[PDB]
Amino acid sequence: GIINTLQKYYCRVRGGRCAVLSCLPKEEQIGKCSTRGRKCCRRKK
C-alpha cells in the first residue's frame, strides 16, 4: 500500500526542538529526537 509514516525523520524533515526526557507542555511530539529516551516537540500554532 501507500506509506505515510516517517517518525524516523519527522523531526528531521521539519521538526523543531528536542527534549531530554519528556516533551514540552507548550509543544506536541512529532518524532524521536534521538533514539531512546528522547523525543521531538513542536510549539503549537
Cα 41 to Cα 4: distance, rounded to the nearest angstrom? 19
Positions of E strands within 1-45: 17-19, 27-31, 39-43
Way the structure was solved: NMR
Reading the block at residue 5, the C-alpha cell is 509514516
CA 22 to chain centre: 11
> Phi and psi at residue 14, in whole multiples of 5°?
-175, 35
Please tell me the total number of residues recorded for the chain in this structure: 45
Spatial distance between the Cα atoms of 5 and 44, rounded to a whole number of angstroms: 21
Fold classification of 1-45 is Antimicrobial Peptide, Beta-defensin 2; Chain A (3.10.360)
Residues pairing with 17 in the sheet: 41
Other CB atoms within a 10 A radius of the CB of residue 33 amount to 21
- Phi then psi for residue 10, to 5 deg, are -60, -30
- Note whether 41 and 35 are within 8 A (CB): no
Residue with grid cell 523531526, as numbered in its chain: 11
> Which residue has cell 510549539?
43
